[PDB]
């Protein structure tokens, strides 16, 4: 499908941007330990063979995770603290590319006449960081979780092409 | 009876400067027994009064290393014990690796040899924030220094647990490992170089995937090629598309070395080691 | 309170057209001074309007008709000739004239690495009126933010949103002024075919080995290599030559970070320069890199 | 008096600025007839010999008139209509010079220990213009009245020096 | 009796195309009287029946201009009347001026002469938005074409009223005049030019106020000087401070013309006419 | 919840001084892993801090002392060595260093005709810290609006209020940064003595009359003549001369709009240029006018 080809190309682009900024961040603000947040999804639970699964669940699952990540990325910029102004304008560019891709995903489902998932209840607001450094620690958890989601997204979209 | 042994059935172990408690192996706990030093007739004593089932040595120094004899008062040899002195194990050195995206494997070496029998318990768990608790890592042939984990989650993080134990104590090495970080594919195979007729400064290089990497649309590999003419000191680097690359700046009339390496197509893990060099010469 | 007013309030008309202005006096003002439309004289910018161009419609209103309007700015005043030896102002208006905007043509866009999408267009005939320019772009499923041109650069706009490659975008420019509204033709394209990469940097020449007549060129490619495949043009000439030569494009038709130039004369100094663009030739050539010098071995 | 000398020099400067802008305005937007406003002062009622009068009345009288003119000039800028934007930035510069001179007048009275006049009740708001051209007509009345006030101000201040 | 006359005591006036009504001057109103045309014996009649105190002519054309005689039936000459034909006055032409800041004066001329006796009524008022109503402007010597207003308000506006009236109607000229706009001082007096020893290209010009301008700290005058060497076509202009100006670019050995004009020190009104030229020659 | 924090949050210190950082662990974190201050290791920007610089104060806190601080930016991290074969981050802070601002010197202002007052000053030693500059000016009876320097021109400011001649104004610059606040010396002056007029325009030379060797210069003075009396400097030279000559200032020491230059050679071409400034020499000379050419008569 020509429409599926175009969407996959843009996903690889966003994955590369996320990896570079995450690696740049650890060089300037090193992280010691794997950081987690209760408000971030922890849906990235699977092995290799997971390709096996069907299309409706993957697209629904991708959409829910990315909307949470968009909220968290935007939250980081407006209130993360002056310590993270150095991650601009790259962080703001990353935010803008992600909102449009979510739109592209809704269009893909519409053009393929797929059932749309029910509007899930949006997650409550993230509390502001307790300190400037707490926001930096939160960024490591967010970027690591994002690039993992995107890594599994590229793979999954390529698998569907292999079937339909 | 007495604390059952570690290795062989009638030998016990101890640490210098400690208290060591020898037991008579083939004697019922509660039977009075006599103790001698080899070649020395003196009935030995120990801190709890003088006639038990177990000799104790608070001395524990090197002169106390050797063979001890215990016998019941009838004259029957109730057994023999050898006191070998040593030290608790040091923390072992652990490394893991993975040449594919499904399974990985880890190996371990002692950081210090004690001269005492040694063995390793290995296990691992998945940190979260389906019993994801501690899962054993079975050691595949015999009790080799290698275990394999099949069907691991590619993106999840695992805490690998190698714990060394000896007859005098234990030390556990823990190593965090994520499949997405540790992965390193094997180099491509079958690198061949051919002349390009009509073009005195072009060579065509071709190669295939490594056999340890099954070709699949889900995990491609990207490639990085380096080439260097014989006698030249500096490598030239290209980032080829696909399994072929036409070099266009080959020096005329000279053998050229070419080598390539592999990496996960989504830049996961690290680049492979360089393939064996293959040589060709332009037409 | 005033005696009257002129209608329309402040019209703008097209050159060579006609305009009729009507001044109407309130009954109360006409009564106090005992006058009517016949007493109205019109003057503009110190020039007396000739009585013959007036037309008295009602006893309250007089009117004038301008033909082939040719002045860009007309200050119109309506006056009455009180008790025949004085003049007082009833009303006034400012008349502005000009032309409608021309249809924008030759619309083209360019994405300079590190900058947001920028589009350029040819403006047409001068209109003499304050004209606003807004660059429009929108997807089939989303209407996008307007781009308002800057005072300094009214014929160019630079969007405020980051470029998104691999997605077709519909773009057009909308020109509008007091005398008319018109839209340029719509264009459709993939931003990936309109990239203008930065020029190569980190240029190195390296001296020759145990073999002479050979020079290897090295440089660091621009970060943009992660989205598109680069193609290059390598030019070279002798330190004394007047024109540049060029390597056959076919030999440098794909991404690379080095090239060894051959058949150069021994112990001769050579100057090099390079440029790059998308491998398929769809886009714009980057600028020339920094000049580089080198010397062949003995 | 050195203080009186300085104040007189600044008044001549403001008079010249007002005359130039008033004359510039009639060149671009001619006026037909003498325009008046009920809200403007009409205190400029006197002949030549009026120099005769005493100092407290002149300073009190100058202060009251100028405060009304300041209100009217500021009123013209913010709401006179787009037709009069061409009179900027000169009109805004004129406004700024006038507020400070009023301050200088209060300082003069303080330094000379003169009785200060009682705070008079400020005039109600000027109605907005009924049309853009009504604002232009209002400007002719205001500028003519201002430059007349300033012309008589220069003369009066010079007369006091001649006595004390 | 009858409407009393305008000028001389026994002459009346009329307009062509109108009705004109002659009266017998020295006859009681109500006495029957007879009328004749000079040299013609016919008893004249008029539209109201035939025997009154007043002859009327609806004709009124040029042939009707001349001398008429009225007499009572006794034969006594009750008087003589002359019919002179004319037209109502045209609007007069009025100008005002002022060479000082206190008083001003205005003059007037007919815009058209009728050939009939004429006189002017002059007055003025102060427009507001102390009787500021209509105030007469007295004509100082005899009944000249000039009136003077003393102690005028410098900043107030005045509406000057010259109204022409003749025996057949009236026409009023109104002229708005403000002292601050109309003022024009006389030129300075006594312009003298002197050489400047030691400097072959400098001249010193000096002058005084005009006598019509009393020197006062309240109304100074600013000055504008122009100078030109003999045979030169173009004036040079300076804006001197004070009553003196040293010219520094005088052409050596040549007569120079210098002239100056005056204006209100606060740029009120307009510049005076140029003084008579005064000449000097550098040393 | 986190294990601890470092205090002070984000300090800024002066070069060559000392800084002590204290990391404190919460009781709950110490209990779960069974550790205390003795287990803290400090690392910064990939460099292991040597254990010998640590000082364990309480069982909950460890501290390090830096001497002769020389790094402009230090990223500090506090870590604990859990169960001896792993390391987890407790807290982190960023240490910034630099110097206090130097006292601004050589403060001077200038009023360019048509522009608002502008003041210039010499900044001192680089401070390596983000420093804001605000120009202060105030009357004895009024505190005036602050002038905030522009990113491009941090050593200059242009006020937003129009210039008011004939009134003394008190002006000074205030320099402040994270390490210190200081004010420049206060200056006092009348704006009338700091005017920089525009250069003369409308330059005319006029040809010679029936007498030769004479040229009259005419021009239009700048509008600023209404507030100050102008003085001029007229320079002239022959079309081939290499240097300019000048009329004696005393002869052109007062406002004028023309001047006749004498003793010039017949049928010779002359070039002129003029400049002006306040008559008393208090202020700044304007730029040179446009060049003018002329020819003497036959
Ligand atoms: C890493 O893996 C090793 C091996 O599985 C772990 O050593 C294990 O340590 C636990 C203590 O947490 C031992 O539990 C036992 O509890 C009983 C009852 O209280 C007691 O008798 C033992 O002395 C011991 O405390 C467990 O036996 C031991 N494993 C082996 C094979 O001996 C280590 O804890 C792991 N570390 C992790 C997962 O972080
Ligand atoms: C300008 O001045 C002249 C002279 O003063 C004014 O002519 C004057 O006109 C008024 C009418 O407004 C005359 O009033 C008279 O009223 C009586 C009673 O009704 C009537 O019998 C007269 O025929 C006339 O209407 C006044 O007589 C006349 N002045 C003279 C000397 O004859 C003129 O109105 C003034 N215009 C202004 C001030 O605008
Ligand atoms: C005199 O002419 C004016 C001008 O046309 C008339 O005013 C117009 O009246 C119509 C409706 O009656 C309105 O639609 C127009 O807008 C009015 N014109 C303006 C300029 O406002 C007016 O009614 C006429 N009066 C008479 C008595 O005929
Ligand atoms: C251990 O040391 C810390 C560090 O000084 C102590 O915390 C300080 O307590 C005082 C008052 O008790 C506060 O003013 C300081 O602000 C605290 N320091 C910090 C960094 O917050 C702590 O009280 C000490 N604990 C014991 C048991 O001695
Ligand atoms: C991974 O383990 C499975 C389980 O037997 C095996 O079939 C597969 O071949 C292994 N992967 C590779 C690359 O050998
Ligand atoms: C008035 O307008 C008409 C049509 O726009 C035009 O033909 C004509 O020349 C104009 N001028 C007139 C009628 O004077
Ligand atoms: C465009 O038109 C609007 C009309 O409201 C006007 O206010 C504005 O100044 C014009 N120019 C720009 C750049 O917006
Ligand atoms: C103005 O009139 C008064 C009144 O008599 C007179 O004294 C004075 O001299 C006049 N002014 C001039 C300048 O003549
Ligand atoms: C600590 O600070 C003091 C005073 O500021 C200084 O003399 C000393 O050299 C510094 N360094 C130390 C004590 O190591
Ligand atoms: C000056 O300091 C403030 C501190 O709140 C900061 O926000 C600002 O960015 C700095 N620079 C300027 C130009 O205001």
CATH at residue D138: 1.20.1250.10
Ligand nearest to C-alpha E165: 2
Gap from CA of E275 to ligand 4 centroid (Å): 96
Per-residue burial over D58-84, b = 16 or more CB atoms within 10 Å of its CB, e = otherwise: bbbbbbebbbbbbebbebbeeebeebb
- How far apart are alpha carbons E3 and F60 in whole angstroms? 130
Identify the three-state secondary structure at position D103: helix
| Both structure tokens of F3 | 């294990």
Phi, psi of D92 (to 5 degrees): -70, -35
- How far apart are alpha carbons D45 and D47 in whole angstroms? 7
Closest ligand 4 atom to F60 CA: 1
Instruction: Quote the DSSP letter at residue F101.
Output: P
Q: In terms of CA atoms, which chain E residue is nearest residue F221?
A: E238
Whether E134 is in the pocket of ligand 2, judged by its Cβ within 6 Å, is yes
Residue E96 CB burial class (10 angstroms; 0-12, 13-18, ≥19): buried
Overall number of domains in chain D: 1
Whether B186 is in the pocket of ligand 5, judged by its Cβ within 6 Å, is no
- How far apart are alpha carbons A80 and A90 in whole angstroms? 15
User: Taking CB atoms and an 8 Å cutoff, what residues of chain E touch D16?
Assistant: 267
Residue C182 CB burial class (10 angstroms; 0-12, 13-18, ≥19): middle
Mark the breaks in chain C: residue after which each occurs, C to N over 2.5 Å. none
Task: For residue F10, give the nearest of A28, A132, A134 by CB distance.
Answer: A132
Closest ligand 1 atom to B165 CA: 32
How do beta strands B77-85 and B12-14 pair? parallel
Measured CA to CA in angstroms, residue D95 lies from C265, D66, D89, D106 at distances of 78, 11, 10, 18
- How far apart are alpha carbons F232 and F131 in whole angstroms? 42
| Both structure tokens of B88 | 């608790």
Most distant CA atoms of chain F, gap in Å: 113
- Report the structure determination method: X-ray
- How far apart are alpha carbons C215 and C211 in whole angstroms? 10
**Through-space distance between the first and last CA atoms of chain B, rounded to whole angstroms:** 85
Q: Which helix (H) or strand (E) holds B119?
A: strand B119-126
Domain that holds residue C78: 4-98
Residues C98, C74 contacting (CB under 8 angstroms): no
DSSP for A56-125? HHHHHHHHHHHHHHHHHHHHHHHHS-GGGGGGTTHHHHHHHHHHHHHHHHHHHHHHTTPPPPP-PPPPPP
Q: In terms of CA atoms, which chain A residue is nearest residue C162?
A: A93
DSSP for F147-216? EEPPSS-TTEEE-SS---TTS-EEEEEEEEETTEEEE---EEE-GGGSEEPPPPEEEE-----SS-SEEE
Give me the sign of the Cα torsion angle D58, D60, D62, D64. Answer: negative
- How far apart are alpha carbons D101 and D8 in whole angstroms? 10
Q: What is the CATH number of domain E12-85?
A: 2.60.40.10
Q: Are B248 and C206 inside 8 Å of each other by CB?
A: no
Write down how long chain D is: 164
CB proximity A47 to B under 8 Å: yes
| C-alpha gyration radius of chain F | 34
Q: How many CB atoms lie within 10 A of CB F121?
A: 20
Task: For residue F141, give the nearest of D10, D93, D103 by CB distance.
Answer: D103
- How far apart are alpha carbons D120 and D137 in whole angstroms? 28
Q: Are D10 and F227 inside 8 Å of each other by CB?
A: no
Task: For residue D32, give the nearest of C2, C79, C94 by CB distance.
Answer: C79
CB proximity D36 to E under 8 Å: yes
Whether C241 is in the pocket of ligand 3, judged by its Cβ within 6 Å, is no
Nearest to E281 by CA among E237, E236, E251: E251
Measured CA to CA in angstroms, residue C214 lies from C217, C261, C263, C290, E159 at distances of 10, 6, 7, 21, 103
- How far apart are alpha carbons E75 and E78 in whole angstroms? 9
B-contacting chains (≥3 CB pairs under 8 Å): A, C, F
- How far apart are alpha carbons E228 and E256 in whole angstroms? 6
Nearest to E276 by CA among E184, E204, E187: E187
Residues A75, A67 contacting (CB under 8 angstroms): no
Architecture of domain E93-182: Sandwich (2.60)
Resolution in A, one decimal?
3.8
Whether F67 is in the pocket of ligand 9, judged by its Cβ within 6 Å, is yes
Q: Which residues contact C166 (CB under 8 A, 6 or more apart)?
A: A6, A9, A10, A13, C190, C191, C192
- Of all protein residues, the one whose alpha carbon is nearest to atom 1 of ligand 9 is F18
Q: Which helix (H) or strand (E) holds E82?
A: strand E77-85
Whether B172 is in the pocket of ligand 1, judged by its Cβ within 6 Å, is yes
Residues F239, F270 contacting (CB under 8 angstroms): yes
Residue for token pair 């008139």: D65
Gap from CA of C18 to ligand 6 centroid (Å): 6
Residues C270, C238 contacting (CB under 8 angstroms): yes
- How far apart are alpha carbons E122 and E161 in whole angstroms? 6
- Give the full edge-to-edge strand order of the sheet including F54-58: F4-7, F19-25, F61-66, F54-58
Gap from CA of B185 to ligand 5 centroid (Å): 15
- How far apart are alpha carbons B13 and B23 in whole angstroms? 11
How do beta strands C73-80 and C88-98 pair? antiparallel
Instruction: Quote the DSSP letter at residue B71.
Output: E
Q: Which residues contact C129 (CB under 8 A, 6 or more apart)?
A: C12, C96, C98, C99, C177, C178, C179
In the Cβ-directed half-sphere of B277, how many Cα atoms lie within 13 Å?
Answer: 12
Q: Which residues contact F47 (CB under 8 A, 6 or more apart)?
A: none
User: Taking CB atoms and an 8 Å cutoff, what residues of chain F touch A83?
Assistant: 10, 94
Instruction: Quote the DSSP letter at residue B185.
Output: P
Instruction: Quote the DSSP letter at residue F99.
Output: -
- Mark whether C82 and C67 lie in a shared domain: yes
Q: How many CB atoms lie within 10 A of CB A84?
A: 20
Task: Return the HEC string of E152-206.
Answer: CCCCCEEEEEEEEEECCEEEEEEEEEEHHHHCCCCCCEEEEEEECCCCCCCEEEE
Counting ligand 6 atoms within 8 A of each CB, the residue from C67, C68, C69 with the most, and so the one to mutate, is C67
Residues C254, C246 contacting (CB under 8 angstroms): no
How do beta strands B236-238 and E221-229 pair? unpaired
- Of all protein residues, the one whose alpha carbon is nearest to atom 2 of ligand 6 is C18
B-contacting residues in F 51-90 (Cβ below 8 Å): 83-86
Q: Which helix (H) or strand (E) holds B170?
A: strand B169-178
Residues E212, E200 contacting (CB under 8 angstroms): no
Q: Which helix (H) or strand (E) holds A26?
A: helix A2-28
Whether E125 is in the pocket of ligand 2, judged by its Cβ within 6 Å, is yes
Counting ligand 4 atoms within 8 A of each CB, the residue from F5, F8, F24, F37 with the most, and so the one to mutate, is F24
Q: Which residues pair with F269 in a beta bridge?
A: F295
DSSP for chain C? ---EEEESSS-EEETT--EEEEEEE-HHHHHHHT--GGGEEEEETTEEPPGGGEEEEETTEEEEEE-S---SEEEEEEEE-GGGT--EEEEEEEEEEE-PPPPPEEEEEEEETTS--EEEEE--S--SS--EEEEEEEETTEEPPPEEPPSS-TTEEE-SS---TTS-EEEEEEEEETTEEEE---EEE-GGGSEEPPPPEEEE-----SS-SEEEEEEE--GGGGTS-EEEEEEEEETT-SS-EE--GGGG-S--SEEEEESPPTT-EEEEEEEEEETTS-S-PPPP---EEEE---
Task: For residue D33, give the nearest of C75, C89, C93 by CB distance.
Answer: C89
Residues of chain B with CATH 2.60.40.10: 12-85, 93-182, 189-280
How do beta strands C169-177 and C180-183 pair? antiparallel
Residues D135, C91 contacting (CB under 8 angstroms): no
Nearest to E34 by CA among E5, E49, E54, E63: E54
Pairs of CB atoms within 8 A across A/F = 33
Identify the three-state secondary structure at position F1: coil
Gap from CA of B174 to ligand 1 centroid (Å): 12
Nearest to B161 by CA among F35, E260, F83: F83
Instruction: Quote the DSSP letter at residue E212.
Output: T
- Of all protein residues, the one whose alpha carbon is nearest to atom 17 of ligand 4 is F7
Residue F217 CB burial class (10 angstroms; 0-12, 13-18, ≥19): buried
CATH number of the domain to which F291 belongs: 2.60.40.10
Interface of F with A (CB under 8 A): 2, 5, 9-10, 43, 45-46, 75, 77, 79, 87-89, 91-94
Nearest to A42 by CA among A16, A69, A80: A69
Q: Which helix (H) or strand (E) holds F262?
A: strand F258-262
- Of all protein residues, the one whose alpha carbon is nearest to atom 4 of ligand 5 is B150
Pairs of CB atoms within 8 A across D/F = 24
Identify the three-state secondary structure at position B180: helix
Q: Which residues contact D63 (CB under 8 A, 6 or more apart)?
A: D102, D105, D106, D117
- Of all protein residues, the one whose alpha carbon is nearest to atom 2 of ligand 9 is F18
Instruction: Quote the DSSP letter at residue B40.
Output: B
Interface of D with F (CB under 8 A): 6, 9-10, 13, 16, 92-93, 96-97, 100, 103-104, 107
Q: Which CATH superfamily is domain E189-280 in?
A: Immunoglobulins (2.60.40.10)
| Both structure tokens of A102 | 């979510």
Instruction: Quote the DSSP letter at residue F100.
Output: P
Whether C58 is in the pocket of ligand 3, judged by its Cβ within 6 Å, is yes
- How far apart are alpha carbons E243 and E240 in whole angstroms? 7
Residue F194 CB burial class (10 angstroms; 0-12, 13-18, ≥19): buried
Asked if the peptide bond before residue A130 counts as cis, ω within 30 degrees of 0, the response is no
- How far apart are alpha carbons B186 and B188 in whole angstroms? 7
Q: Are E128 and D15 inside 8 Å of each other by CB?
A: no
- How far apart are alpha carbons B193 and B176 in whole angstroms? 42
Whether F18 is in the pocket of ligand 9, judged by its Cβ within 6 Å, is yes
In the Cβ-directed half-sphere of B219, how many Cα atoms lie within 13 Å?
Answer: 23
- Mark whether C65 and C122 lie in a shared domain: no
Q: In terms of CA atoms, which chain E residue is nearest residue D40?
A: E129
Q: Are F85 and B174 inside 8 Å of each other by CB?
A: yes
Whether B163 is in the pocket of ligand 1, judged by its Cβ within 6 Å, is yes
Gap from CA of C67 to ligand 5 centroid (Å): 93
Q: Are F85 and B175 inside 8 Å of each other by CB?
A: yes
Gap from CA of A74 to ligand 7 centroid (Å): 32
Domain that holds residue A66: 2-163
Asked if the peptide bond before residue C8 counts as cis, ω within 30 degrees of 0, the response is yes
User: Taking CB atoms and an 8 Å cutoff, what residues of chain E touch C82?
Assistant: none
**Through-space distance between the first and last CA atoms of chain F, rounded to whole angstroms:** 101
Q: Which residues contact B66 (CB under 8 A, 6 or more apart)?
A: B37, B38, B82, B83
Q: Are B252 and C262 inside 8 Å of each other by CB?
A: yes
Residues F243, F271 contacting (CB under 8 angstroms): no
Residues F226, F251 contacting (CB under 8 angstroms): no
- Give the full edge-to-edge strand order of the sheet including B66-72: B12-14, B77-85, B66-72, B33-37
Overall number of domains in chain C: 3
Residues B103, B177 contacting (CB under 8 angstroms): no
Q: Which helix (H) or strand (E) holds D18?
A: helix D2-28
Nearest to B238 by CA among C218, C20, C15: C218
In the Cβ-directed half-sphere of D131, how many Cα atoms lie within 13 Å?
Answer: 17
- How far apart are alpha carbons B169 and B234 in whole angstroms? 54
Opening angle at CA D163, ends D160 and D164, nearest 5:
85
Residues B24, B36 contacting (CB under 8 angstroms): no
Q: Distance (Å) from the C-alpha of residue C209 to the closest C-alpha of chain A?
A: 37
User: Taking CB atoms and an 8 Å cutoff, what residues of chain F touch E228?
Assistant: none
Asked if the peptide bond before residue C135 counts as cis, ω within 30 degrees of 0, the response is no
Nearest to F260 by CA among F229, F286, F236, F225: F236
Q: Which helix (H) or strand (E) holds D110?
A: helix D90-111
- How far apart are alpha carbons E223 and E191 in whole angstroms? 13
Q: Are F162 and D16 inside 8 Å of each other by CB?
A: no
User: Taking CB atoms and an 8 Å cutoff, what residues of chain C touch B233?
Assistant: 209
Residue for token pair 């539209």: E47
Q: Which helix (H) or strand (E) holds D11?
A: helix D2-28
F-contacting residues in E 210-239 (Cβ below 8 Å): 231-234, 236-239
């Amino acid at each position: 499908r020509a429409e599926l080809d175009s969407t996959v190309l843009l996903t690889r682009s966003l994955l590369a941007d996320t990896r570079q900024l995450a690696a740049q961040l650890r060089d300037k603000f090193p992280a010691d330990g794997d950081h987690n947040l209760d408000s971030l999804p922890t849906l990235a639970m699977s092995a290799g063979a997971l390709g096996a699964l069907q299309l409706p669940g993957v697209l629904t699952r991708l959409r829910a995770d990315l909307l949470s990540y968009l909220r968290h990325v935007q939250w980081l910029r407006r209130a993360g603290g002056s310590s993270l102004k150095t991650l601009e304008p790259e962080l703001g560019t990353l935010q803008a590319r992600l909102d449009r891709l979510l739109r592209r995903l809704q269009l893909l489902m519409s053009r393929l006449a797929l059932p749309q998932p029910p509007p899930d209840p949006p997650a409550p607001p993230l509390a502001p960081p307790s300190s400037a450094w707490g926001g930096i620690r939160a960024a490591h958890a967010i970027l690591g979780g994002l690039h993992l989601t995107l890594d599994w997204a590229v793979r999954g979209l390529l698998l569907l092409k292999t079937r339909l | 009876p007495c604390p059952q042994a570690w290795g062989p059935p009638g030998v016990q172990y101890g640490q210098p400067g400690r208290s060591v408690k020898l037991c008579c192996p083939g004697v019922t706990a509660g039977d009075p027994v006599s103790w001698f030093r080899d070649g020395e007739p003196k009935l030995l004593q120990g801190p709890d009064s003088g006639l038990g089932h177990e000799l104790v040595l608070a001395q524990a120094d090197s002169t106390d290393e050797g063979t001890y004899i215990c016998q019941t008062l009838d004259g029957a040899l109730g057994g023999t014990v050898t006191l070998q002195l040593g030290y608790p194990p040091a923390r072992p050195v652990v490394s893991c690796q993975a040449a594919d995206y499904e399974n990985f494997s880890c190996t371990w070496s002692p950081s210090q040899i004690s001269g005492l029998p040694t063995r390793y318990l290995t296990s691992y768990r998945k940190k979260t924030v389906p019993s994801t608790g501690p899962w054993p890592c079975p050691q595949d042939p015999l009790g080799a220094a290698r275990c394999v984990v099949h069907g691991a989650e590619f993106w999840s993080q695992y805490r690998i647990n190698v714990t060394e134990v000896n007859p005098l104590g234990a030390s556990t090495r823990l190593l965090d490992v994520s499949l997405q970080s540790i992965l390193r594919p094997d180099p491509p195979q079958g690198l061949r170089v051919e002349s390009v007729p009509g073009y005195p400064r072009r060579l065509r290089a071709s190669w295939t995937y490594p056999a340890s990497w099954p070709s699949q649309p889900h995990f491609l590999l990207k490639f990085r090629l380096q080439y260097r003419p014989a006698q030249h000191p500096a490598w030239s680097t290209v980032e080829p598309a696909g399994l072929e690359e036409v070099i266009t700046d080959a020096v005329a009339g000279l053998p050229h070395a070419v080598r390539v390496s592999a990496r996960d197509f989504l830049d996961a893990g690290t680049w492979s080691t360089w393939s064996p060099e293959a040589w060709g010469t332009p037409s | 309170d005033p005696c009257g007013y002129i209608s329309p309030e402040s019209p703008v008309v097209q050159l060579h057209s006609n305009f009729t202005a009507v001044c109407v006096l309130k009954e109360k003002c006409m009564d106090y001074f005992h006058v009517n439309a016949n007493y109205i004289v019109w003057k503009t910018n110190h020039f007396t309007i000739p009585k013959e161009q007036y037309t008295i419609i009602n006893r309250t209103a007089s009117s004038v008709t301008f033909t082939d309007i040719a002045s860009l700015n007309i200050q119109l005043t309506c006056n009455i000739l009180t008790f025949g030896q004085l003049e007082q102002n009833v009303y006034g208006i400012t008349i502005i004239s000009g032309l409608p905007p021309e249809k924008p043509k030759n619309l083209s866009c360019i994405v300079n690495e590190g900058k947001k999408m920028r589009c350029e267009w040819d403006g047409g005939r001068e209109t003499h009126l304050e004209t606003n320019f807004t660059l429009k772009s929108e997807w089939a499923t989303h209407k996008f933010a307007d781009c308002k041109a800057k005072r300094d650069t009214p014929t160019s706009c630079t969007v405020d949103y980051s470029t998104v490659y691999f997605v077709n975008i519909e773009v057009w420019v909308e020109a509008e002024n007091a005398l008319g509204k018109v839209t340029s033709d719509h264009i459709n394209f993939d931003p990936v075919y309109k990239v203008k990469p930065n020029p190569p940097h980190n240029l190195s020449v390296i001296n020759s080995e145990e073999l002479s007549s050979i020079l290897k060129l090295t440089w660091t490619n621009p970060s943009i290599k992660s989205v598109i495949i680069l193609k290059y043009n390598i030019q070279y000439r002798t330190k004394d030559a007047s024109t540049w030569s060029q390597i056959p494009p076919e030999d440098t038709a794909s991404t690379r970070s080095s090239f060894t130039v051959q058949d150069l004369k021994p112990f001769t100094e050579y100057v090099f320069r390079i440029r790059c663009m998308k491998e398929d030739g769809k886009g714009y050539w980057s600028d020339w890199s920094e000049e580089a010098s080198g010397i062949t071995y003995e």
